[PDB]
């Protein structure tokens, strides 16, 4: 499960989560799972606006946000429309071929073997899943 804002993965939202995101925005260091947790506003990309929303939440000053909620994801569902199908395959293929970069927040769903790399193995697994040759993704 991915908890929005829970950058260190410990299940609770704290100033350490914020510190890790702030450091990442200076020098990238977050895993795919952390990038999914870091996309506080849900627009797919991890940036200083996400950081700001997390700051306002932690200081008690925030409006309504998804911080603390479990993020809805399905492995292989890269566009997060609730189905794994050939449009998900296209997104990962273009990513691998250099003709379209996956959003920061969708890398976790694309990483079908959970090794924090997007490569041919992920594509093949999604291909097998779509065509019914495997019942689930290994992750």
């Amino acid at each position: 499960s991915v908890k929005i804002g829970d950058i260190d993965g410990n299940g609770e939202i704290s100033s350490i989560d914020y510190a890790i995101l702030k450091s990442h925005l200076i020098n990238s260091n977050l895993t795919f799972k952390q990038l999914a947790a870091a996309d506080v506003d849900g627009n797919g990309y991890v940036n200083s606006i996400d950081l700001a929303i997390l700051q306002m939440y932690l200081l008690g000053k925030g409006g309504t946000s998804d911080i603390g909620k479990n993020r809805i994801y399905t492995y292989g569902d890269i566009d997060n429309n609730g189905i794994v199908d050939e449009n998900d395959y296209i997104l990962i293929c273009n990513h691998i071929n250099g003709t379209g970069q996956l959003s920061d927040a969708s890398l976790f769903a694309a990483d079908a073997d959970g090794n924090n790399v997007i490569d041919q193995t992920d594509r093949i697994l999604i291909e097998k899943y779509i065509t019914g040759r495997i019942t689930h993704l290994p992750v």
Copy 2:
């Protein structure tokens, strides 16, 4: 500062906060300030619904709530209308006299000496505050 759901007052919302509130609902023990923090849904009373909302939040399953937000308190402003006047005084007097009980969440605003009791001392102190004899409630 009162932060909603932050029962232990450490500035963050965690499983410890839930444990303290659950313990209180079994055997009452929260301070007035903790009661203010525990009224998650803002309805004035601290009960199992507040606990349930905190539980859902900590499991990542909650809807929209005020958990984590600061709730601004003005000492002596019992009706939360932004001024301290005779109407706040009446609310504390009735409470003391047993002719109307303050909500759990307003006890912190009424407690002029911070001893987690509302008694004749809180009445005298708000009187002095309203009439300007004391510059601020202790």
